[PDB]
Structures are given as C-alpha cells and as structure tokens.
Amino acid sequence: MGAQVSTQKTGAHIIHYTNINYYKDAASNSANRQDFSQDPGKFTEPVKDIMVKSLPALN
Amino acid sequence: DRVRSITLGNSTITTQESANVVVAYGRWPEYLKDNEATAEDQPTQPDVATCRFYTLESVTWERDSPGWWWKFPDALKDMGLFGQNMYYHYLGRAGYTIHVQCNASKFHQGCLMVVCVPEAEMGCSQVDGTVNEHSLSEGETAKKFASTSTNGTNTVQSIVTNAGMGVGVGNLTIFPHQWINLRTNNCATIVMPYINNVPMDNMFRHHNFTLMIIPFVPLDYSSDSSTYVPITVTVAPMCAEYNGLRLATSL
C-alpha cells in the first residue's frame, strides 16, 4: 500500500523500518536525514590547471 | 488409559486411576546449553543420586479444611544428596515432577485443586509490616490457609479466598494445575520446567514456585464410612545441575 522499507542507522565492528505517507503535499513529509554526499573540491581545489601534489606547485 | 507408571532413578510410581499428565507450558525440563550459559566452571550432574522421588509428610483432610501450601525448593533441603548438593554450591538448577495422591471410597465426596504458582510473593497480616521466612515455610511441613482474616504480628494474611496474594482464588486456573474429584480420579501429576529470569540461581535465597492444595467442595460422608482421609505429596527433581563449589553454608 505504498509502503517504503529502508535500513536503520546502526553501528559497525530487524534493522529496517517502514514508512507510509499520509498527506497529499510533499511539504508534509518528514525530513531527509539519510543522504550523505560530498564534493569538497569545489571549495578546496578551485583552480584551472590541475596540481598533482607530488610535483612542485610552480616552475 | 487410566493406568500409568513413572520411573526415576531407583524409584517408581504406579497408578490405576489417573486423568492425564500436565506439562506446564508444553516444555519439558532440560540441561543448560552453551549459547545460554554465563558461569564458566564445569558443572556437576549427579543424575541418579538427586533425580528421584522424595516423599514429604502427609496432611489430614477434614470436613472444614481451608488448604495447604509448600515452597520449592527449601522443602527438599534435607532430602538425601539433593540437599547435600544444595549446601555446597552457589548455583543450582532443576525441573520437577510432582505427584499428589488421595484415595477414598465410592461413598465419599469432595474436590481438590492442585496448582503450582511461580514466584508466589505473599503479604503480611499487618499492612504496615514485612514478612519473615518462618511464616512463609516450614520445610517438609505444610503451612495452613485460614478461615477468616488473620491478625497479630509476623503471620501471613492467609484467608483462602485471596490466596494470600490479593487475587481471586477462582482465577488460579491460569497457572499449571489439575483437579482431584473423588468420584473420578485419585491422583494428580504435574511436570514443571525451570522458570526464572536468569539461567541459574541460588537455592537458599529464592523460592522458585509454591505448591497449593485447596479444596473447593469439602469432604463429606455418612453413617459408618471411614473418617480418616490423608493427602500425600511426592516430588522428583529432573536435569539437576550445580555450579560454584565451596565450603558448606549454615542456616
């Protein structure tokens, strides 16, 4: 009946849960707490020419 | 279909007027397994010196008798090698077979309830007070329920209708039980497994279950029929295990 089943946050070294949406608007849904992407190069490496890190930066 | 024989160790019970056998919750006694143990030393298992029928002393069923109870263990602490293995170890574990006998003639009448109650915690006749262990148990001798409300200090509130637990006595059928109806059968048999919230326990400190015998229909008879009608209990431990050997405790 439009049920979503997904995994729970556990540790490392039965574990899933169920959700049903009750309302017609998506602004009524609960938060999206399980999306973990990254793109740090946008802020730390914003240069036109690539820098190898074992080579000198100049010359 | 009414005849039965039970053998344990060097002891045997025969009966010719049995109803059936109650297995407490569909579970037979068994030994502790490896994925449920916590104590690490190797346990001892005597296996015929402890697992056999012991008989307690009898009570007299009279025309106005309220009923009787025993506490297990602590009713078998002076019984052979079961009691001696109880005195030298810290942890013990066992199931039981209980057998109650009471016979009478086809001109007598009466009905008894035989019930085993796990963790039967009891209250004092003084509500601003606490109980002691002598009022709870006398070993192989039975405690007696009362006929009215009890008073005085240090005694257990023992009017039969509340079963000394603050409940209705007619609801005790929620526990494992049988009936002895004098026109039908003359014995009751209950097989009880080990029931606790921990896998082993100390046998002097904790009463695992109480045995209650309560007549619902009193004993009646006529002109020259026999007046003396006794009731007898017999108990056998099963799958008995002990851990933690040290010097013998003293009560």
Partner: protein, 285 residues
C-alpha cells in the same frame, strides 16, 4: 532503494454449516480434572449456518495493549525557600506509585522492552500580598544518575556539571521533552515479582526492592532568581515498546497499600444479589 515489507492480517475463524446428528460422537462430554479446556464450537452442539467472519484480534496483541503513555510520578520544587532541600526534586525510578500502569504491568511475571519517556513541567506563582512583575522564561534541568554516582546537595552543587550523566535542558513554552531508553537490566528480563530475600541467611529485604536498582532523577530550576517565589511541578510519562512478556497471572483484586510490598486488606469476591435465581424483569407494559 525501496524494500517491500508484507504484513499478514490475522482474522478469527469462520463458523461452518452443520446439520442434524445421531451417533456415538460426544463432543459436549469432557472432564475438567485433566487440566484441559474444551475446544468446542457452536457447530458441535446446534445446527448452524455458514458465516464468513472478518473480525481481527489486532487491538488485543500485547504491543497494542501496552504501547500507551501513563503517568508514573509527579513532584514539586521551589525557586526560593528556607530549606534548600525543597529547591530541587529527586526520586528513585520505578513504576509502582501510580496504580493503573502498575496493575496493567502485573498481569505478567516477566517483561522486557525499550521505553519512551516524556516530561510535562508547569509553573505557578506563590500566593503573596504584593503582585506584579515581569519574569523572563524559566529554564529547567533534568539529570539522571545511575547507581553509584555522586548526589547533589544543593542547587549550586558542582555535580550539575553533568559531564558524563545524561541531562535535559528545557524552557517553558516549547513542546514537552522526550527521549528513549533501551532495555537496561543485569538480568535477561525484568521481574515484577520476586519470592526471595537479599541475604543468603533468608532474611534482610524481601520481595521487589531487591532486584530493581535503576538510579535516580534530579530536577532543578536553572535561573537561580525570582525575588518573588514560584513553584514548579514535574510529571513523568512512560511508554513501553518492542515488548515481550512471560507467564501470565490473575489480575489484582485487592487495593494496593504501598509501593514496596504486595500487602493487602481482605476483600470480597464480588457484590451480592437477592437469591441464586434472581432475574431483573425488563419487558413490562
């Protein structure tokens, strides 16, 4: 990724059609001495029609029966006094002081579950002759102390540092605070009844208080203020979830007396009527 989880609906049994009979089968004759309860249905004693039954036993499962919030404690504490012990509230954790939840729990011998805990805090002004002042929002602190931790002596004691104890800070006008607790017991399941002692000599403490030992709760005002005194009341609510129970018992008949024992006063089995045949007549012109 999406995973479909199936839920089996469980309905009651249908009644089947049955006709007249004349034979040696005697389904209605039994013997209660065996300890067995008869499994006879109406179709074994009368003539019946076929009915398709759609009723479900969903609201009588243990989880739906026990998963509701109940009050378990209420307490008071002041912002200003001359006692310094009435400036904070403290109590030992159990579920034995409010009779409704505790009678509901005592239908079973052993229970195991996680918990959801909610707090409801309210404040009020103490009756004085001169009124009138504006007070900023009040903040409250709740600290849980497991057995063995140091105990606060006042509202300014160093122990409210709460370096390792878990605490809640809250301010009035917001939603009630809430948190969940796992199954915390040194045993494999909780025990509601204990027919035993604490000392190996069969004396000492009898019954329930031997086994619980689950810490304390302390609550205070954080502002440390209010030349005109105020008074707060805190109420705590429990809600069990992910439940398992064992060994059912008969429900409590007598009224409770105190939180430590099972002590009682003898009570009747029921109330009376006129005679064993009495019938109330309700069809009269």
């Amino acid at each position: 990724v999406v995973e479909a989880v199936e839920n089996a609906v469980a309905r009651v049994a249908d009644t089947i059609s049955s006709g007249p009979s004349n034979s040696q089968a005697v389904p209605a004759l039994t013997a209660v001495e065996t300890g067995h309860t008869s499994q006879v249905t109406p179709s074994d004693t009368i003539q019946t029609r076929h009915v398709r039954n759609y009723h479900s036993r969903s609201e009588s499962s243990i989880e739906n029966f026990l998963c509701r919030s109940a009050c378990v404690y209420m307490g008071e504490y002041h912002t200003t006094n001359t006692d310094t012990s009435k400036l904070f509230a403290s109590w030992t954790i159990n579920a034995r002081r409010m009779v409704q939840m505790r009678r509901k729990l005592e239908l079973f011998t052993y229970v195991r579950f996680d918990m959801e805990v909610t707090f409801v805090i309210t404040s009020k002004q103490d009756q004085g002759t001169q009124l009138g002042q504006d007070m900023p929002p009040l903040t409250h602190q709740i600290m849980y102390i497991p057995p063995g931790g140091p105990i606060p002596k006042s509202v300014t004691d160093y122990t409210w540092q709460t370096s390792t104890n878990p605490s809640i800070f809250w301010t009035e006008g917001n939603a009630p605070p809430r948190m969940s607790i796992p199954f915390i017991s040194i045993g494999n399941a909780y025990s509601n009844f204990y027919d035993g002692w604490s000392h190996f000599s069969q004396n000492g403490v009898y019954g329930y208080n031997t086994l619980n030992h689950m810490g304390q709760i302390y609550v205070r005002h954080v502002n440390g203020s209010s030349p005109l005194p105020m008074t707060s009341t805190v109420r705590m609510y429990f809600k069990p979830k992910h439940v398992k129970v064992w060994v059912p018992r008969p429900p409590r008949l007598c009224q409770y007396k105190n939180a430590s024992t099972v002590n009682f006063t003898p009570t009747n089995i029921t109330e009376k009527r006129q005679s064993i045949n009495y019938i109330p007549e309700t069809v009269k012109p």
